[PDB]
Design a protein around this ligand. Structure first.
Ligand SMILES: [Cl-]
Lengths: 48, 223, 53
């Protein structure tokens, strides 16, 4: 029912960086994915 | 008084309650100690741009964008000059198929707000880079009451409810008076499962015209 | 295609009876990944998406 979401993203200048979101429902995750503007290099979803 | 008269006359009792005072105190600390979006001056922008009397359409979102330069205190919209996120791009793609509008060179929906579209998120703040971090802090209590007072309005409101979380608010809305346009969410995971082809913009305008109200000019002009 | 990237997807899934199993998908577009996510009925325990260089 609850998930942690980790993404490796790449900005327009080529810099790669991790974001860490915690305690999301799958619905929250689906919305988060649609709210992620930079290129997704890696994505991890892990049930808590 | 934190809001213009037509909203304040409906909501003033909420702002006096303990839960709001607790929320305000939490936010005063968090704005000082970390990075919170949107900017604090922008928290109520959806209500500043769209008065209670002027509401024609409500587009419900969840929480603000969590990255720098994005959130304006409006659901879905972004400040001019930043990249449009994927769901917002999908909104513009549907708008293009439905109404015909060209895709704009920015993602700001302020034009819609100025024409009576209430761009209401259910949670009004977020910590940078941490989605849903202000869930359950008091905002949902207030935004439920905003929905309640709109439901209580005599003059009908058109509610656009994209996705499961927004659709849960149907229980608060008096459908003997108000109109509901609902579909799957514009997120890339769900857009091609109902959102695309739903024609929410022309449908909203058709409800307005039936009521003798002026339609929304949905097309966003380049900056 | 020299103008498009591909992705690998790994999922650890759990069936209705509680058995956990891995599923491996290779060479997907981003759109393919999104469709795959929607078509996955079993419970997600882990999901990994990796862009292929
Ligand atoms: Cl949906």
């Amino acid at each position: 029912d609850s998930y942690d979401v980790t993404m490796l993203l790449q900005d327009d200048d080529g810099k790669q960086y991790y974001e860490y979101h915690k305690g999301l429902s799958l619905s929250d995750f689906e919305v988060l994915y649609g709210n992620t503007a930079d290129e997704i290099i890696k994505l991890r979803l892990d049930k808590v | 008084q934190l809001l213009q008269d037509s909203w304040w006359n409906q909501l003033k009792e909420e702002f006096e309650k303990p839960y709001y005072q607790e929320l305000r105190e939490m936010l005063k600390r968090e704005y000082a100690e970390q990075t919170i979006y949107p900017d604090s001056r922008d928290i109520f922008n959806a209500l500043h741009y769209t008065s209670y009397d002027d509401v024609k359409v409500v587009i419900l979102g969840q929480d603000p964008y969590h990255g720098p330069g994005q959130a304006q205190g409006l659901s879905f919209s972004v400040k001019p000059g930043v990249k449009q996120p994927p769901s917002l791009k999908n909104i513009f793609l549907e708008l293009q198929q439905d109404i015909g509008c060209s895709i704009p060179n920015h993602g700001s929906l302020v034009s819609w707000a100025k024409q009576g579209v209430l761009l209401l998120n259910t949670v009004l703040t977020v910590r940078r880079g941490q989605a849903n971090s202000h869930k359950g802090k008091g905002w949902e209590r207030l935004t439920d009451r905003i929905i309640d007072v709109l439901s209580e309005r005599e003059r009908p409101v058109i509610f656009i409810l994209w996705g499961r979380h927004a659709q849960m608010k149907k229980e608060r809305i008096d459908t003997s008076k108000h109109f509901i346009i609902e579909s799957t969410h514009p997120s890339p995971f769900s857009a091609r499962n109902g959102f695309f082809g739903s024609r929410p913009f022309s449908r909203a305008n058709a409800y307005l015209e039936k009521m003798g109200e002026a339609p929304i000019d949905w097309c966003i002009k380049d900056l």
